[PDB]
Amino acid sequence: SSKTQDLLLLDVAPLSLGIETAGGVMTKLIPRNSTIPTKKSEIFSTYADNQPGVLIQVFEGERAKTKDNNLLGKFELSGIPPAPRGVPQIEVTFDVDSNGILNVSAVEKGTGKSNKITITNDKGRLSKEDIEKMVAEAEKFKEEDEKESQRIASKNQLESIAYSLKNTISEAG
Incomplete structure (x- = not known):
């Protein structure tokens, strides 16, 4: 009820709040410990x-990997x-207000379309365990996960359709 x-x-x-970019690369816009309101537009x-x-x-x-x-x-x-x-410029704005409600707005500059969704921090999104897990795992594999992002490099993308x-x-490596 939040x-x-x-x-x-x-x-x-x-x-950290962000998007998946094609390949299982997690692109962070709003980082953890960052005090809101915070609107980030890229x-x-x-x-x-x-x-x-x-x-x-x-x-x-x-995680570097969205899974x-x-x-x-x-x-x-x-x-x-x-x-x-790269013809249509889609500015994806993560607008997180003081109540922690994430309004993600995507604005397409080519034709001028805009669509936003209201994602509120309300559900059992994370448990207390999950929060610590993701934080701990990224810290745990501090070298690996950053190298993942850096070796893959392909982030800041948008997918036209869900590739799934x-x-x-042999997973990856």
């Missing part, structure tokens, strides 16, 4: 040409003019 109610100390983001590009829209899948957590991240929700902005990967493919055979 929208005009409280939870103990929602001043800072308990985990212009992302979709890694696909002839796209009909973009999908913004919101993930929370500290250890919490899925908050997603919204599909459909009806974007089919064009090359990993194909983890």
Whole structure:
């Protein structure tokens, strides 16, 4: 029931809020320990040409790989003019207000479309265990997870459609 109610100390983001980028790369916009309100806007590009829209899948957590991240929700902005990967500029704004409600707005600068979703910190999104897990795991594999992001490099992307493919055979490395 948390929208005009409280939870103990929602001043800072308990985990980093961001998106998944194609490949299982977690792109962080609002970091943990960052005191809200905080609105972060970045212009992302979709890694696909002839796209009909973009999908913004919101993930929370500290991992480099989105599989250890919490899925908050997603919204599909459909009806974007089919064009090359980086022709439509989609500015994805994570606007987290003081109540900890994450409003993710995606604004497409090419045609001028905009779509936003209201993701509130209300559900058993994380348990107290989950929060500590994601924090601890990223700290635990502090070298590995940062190298993941750095070796993959491909982040700050948007997907036109949910690819939903990993194909983890021998996983990765």
